[PDB]
Amino acid sequence: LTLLEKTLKERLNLKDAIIVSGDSDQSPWVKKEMGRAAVACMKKRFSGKNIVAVTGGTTIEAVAEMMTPDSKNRELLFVPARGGLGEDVKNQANTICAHMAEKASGTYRLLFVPGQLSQGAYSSIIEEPSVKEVLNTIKSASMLVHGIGEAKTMAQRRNTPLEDLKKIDDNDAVTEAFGYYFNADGEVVHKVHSVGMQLDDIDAIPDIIAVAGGSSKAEAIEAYFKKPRNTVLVTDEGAAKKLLR
Amino acid sequence: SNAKDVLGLTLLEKTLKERLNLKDAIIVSGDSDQSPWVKKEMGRAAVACMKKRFSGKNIVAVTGGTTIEAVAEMMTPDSKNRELLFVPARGGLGEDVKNQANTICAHMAEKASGTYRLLFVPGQLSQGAYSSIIEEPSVKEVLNTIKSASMLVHGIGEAKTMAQRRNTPLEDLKKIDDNDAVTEAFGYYFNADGEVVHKVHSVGMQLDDIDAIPDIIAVAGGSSKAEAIEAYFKKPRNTVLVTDEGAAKKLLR
Numbered sequence A: 001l002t003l004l005e006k007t008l009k010e011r012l013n014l015k016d017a018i019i020v021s022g023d024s025d026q027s028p029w030v031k032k033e034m035g036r037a038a039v040a041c042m043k044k045r046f047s048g049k050n051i052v053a054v055t056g057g058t059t060i061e062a063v064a065e066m067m068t069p070d071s072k073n074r075e076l077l078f079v080p081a082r083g084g085l086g087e088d089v090k091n092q093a094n095t096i097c098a099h100m101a102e103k104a105s106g107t108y109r110l111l112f113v114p115g116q117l118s119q120g121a122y123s124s125i126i127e128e129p130s131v132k133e134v135l136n137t138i139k140s141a142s143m144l145v146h147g148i149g150e151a152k153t154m155a156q157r158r159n160t161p162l163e164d165l166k167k168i169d170d171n172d173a174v175t176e177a178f179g180y181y182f183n184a185d186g187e188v189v190h191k192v193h194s195v196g197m198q199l200d201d202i203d204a205i206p207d208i209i210a211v212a213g214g215s216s217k218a219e220a221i222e223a224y225f226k227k228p229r230n231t232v233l234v235t236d237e238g239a240a241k242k243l244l245r
Numbered sequence B: 001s002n003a004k005d006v007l008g009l010t011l012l013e014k015t016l017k018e019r020l021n022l023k024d025a026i027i028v029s030g031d032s033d034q035s036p037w038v039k040k041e042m043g044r045a046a047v048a049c050m051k052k053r054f055s056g057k058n059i060v061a062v063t064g065g066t067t068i069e070a071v072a073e074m075m076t077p078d079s080k081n082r083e084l085l086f087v088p089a090r091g092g093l094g095e096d097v098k099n100q101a102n103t104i105c106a107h108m109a110e111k112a113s114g115t116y117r118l119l120f121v122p123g124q125l126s127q128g129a130y131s132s133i134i135e136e137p138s139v140k141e142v143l144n145t146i147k148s149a150s151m152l153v154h155g156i157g158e159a160k161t162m163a164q165r166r167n168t169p170l171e172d173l174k175k176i177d178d179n180d181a182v183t184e185a186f187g188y189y190f191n192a193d194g195e196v197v198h199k200v201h202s203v204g205m206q207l208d209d210i211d212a213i214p215d216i217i218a219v220a221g222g223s224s225k226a227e228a229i230e231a232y233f234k235k236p237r238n239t240v241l242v243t244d245e246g247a248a249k250k251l252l253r
């Protein structure tokens, strides 16, 4: 495995690779072990005060589940990286963020701005103090913890307008992260319009941890890391072994 | 039922149904204010009640609070494997929304091996912003599902206890006091005659909606809640109450 990690690192240009045992597509509990490893990676990188941006999805929900209070007692503020991506509440960044904060015995900020508001309603809402302040907090994140999905899988699960499904399909999206759909070369081919973190913003976040696994995600994971992301990947053998096959 | 004979529960249930306008009364032994395990027994009885009421397909609306949490903790899969979708009955708007019904909803659905849909948890926003959000198709779908609820399982609280437990605006605290609220259920505070005197700023189920819900199960007990329970049921609610001797004996004698 030491070798598997080193090879994955070089292939994907990662800051580091953390690989847990097994294939989460065959053994669901393996997702909880990715969660556990992610938490450990987070705690390695915390400073005295931390603003942690987090996405939704079931894998970051596993991070939240495995979260425990910080032993050194460092200060932790969690914020949802970006909302209004059309997920059911169980899968919203806003939900996962609150859950993680609770488990870490930290604090969190709520941010709910849904996907399909009118131009006027969207323009007005993002100027409201509670939103404006949280957007600023997200802008100054010291950490980002995010998932990676297959494009088709994400597009189906979310409430995706028909015209956008077409675009995602016609532009050969294969992977998705934080509301960006990318093709096989790591290029953006569809951006979901939503407030909060933008792709350009991630270069300003010193510690980024991606958490994604399962053999079925091998292609999505490879595609996402086709460009430099300055990111630590937590994955499992299922994804890593299939990617490197 | 030697048991419920000797413990006097069957006779107590009869009288409680005659006194309040109950669809049915289910009373477990003891006083949950004195004996915390009695809450777990209310949860047990409530779960059994739900299972007797389920149709082929169900949309079960739930409230938060420790009593419905105990219902969720006691929930087990349906041996008949009927279709079970759980939703929160309401969601909060305004400052520091916690949406604890969401918490209980997910917990109960997981225990039942059912499915669930939660309500959004907003930050502090203008009414205009809330009005825009409510019409958003994804949000609208959940509200429509709550509107189609086949069952409602809810707590009942003392008005003062709840207004104080919650992040209640000072203007609304004054209103609740000045209008002599004595009881609370699902985001509505009622006076001693069971009339609404204040409604929490929320989305989801409204009091007028409960008539259309075939099965409503209130779960609330302890001597401290006798006055609140009596007040809530001063008006007809077509509701099955699961409670304890603590509440029932104090109310009746």
Ligand SMILES: O=P(O)(O)OC[C@H]1O[C@](O)(COP(=O)(O)O)[C@@H](O)[C@@H]1O
Pocket (backbone or CB within 6 Å): B063, B064, B065, B066, B067, B068, B099, B100, B101, B154, B155, B156, B157, B158, B162, B166, B184, B185, B186, B187
């Ligand atoms: O069962 P408990 O702990 O006495 O709580 C009962 C109360 O909890 C609730 O069900 C839910 O409280 P919230 O609406 O603040 O989340 C109230 O409607 C009810 O008054």
Ligand SMILES: [Cl-]
Pocket (backbone or CB within 6 Å): A021, A022, A023, A024, A026, A027, A030
């Ligand atoms: Cl495995």
Ligand SMILES: [Cl-]
Pocket (backbone or CB within 6 Å): none
């Ligand atoms: Cl463990």
Ligand SMILES: [Cl-]
Pocket (backbone or CB within 6 Å): A056, A082, A083, A084, A085, A086, A087, A088, A091, A092, A093
């Ligand atoms: Cl979302």
Ligand SMILES: [Cl-]
Pocket (backbone or CB within 6 Å): A088, A089, A090, A091, B116, B117, B118
């Ligand atoms: Cl949900």
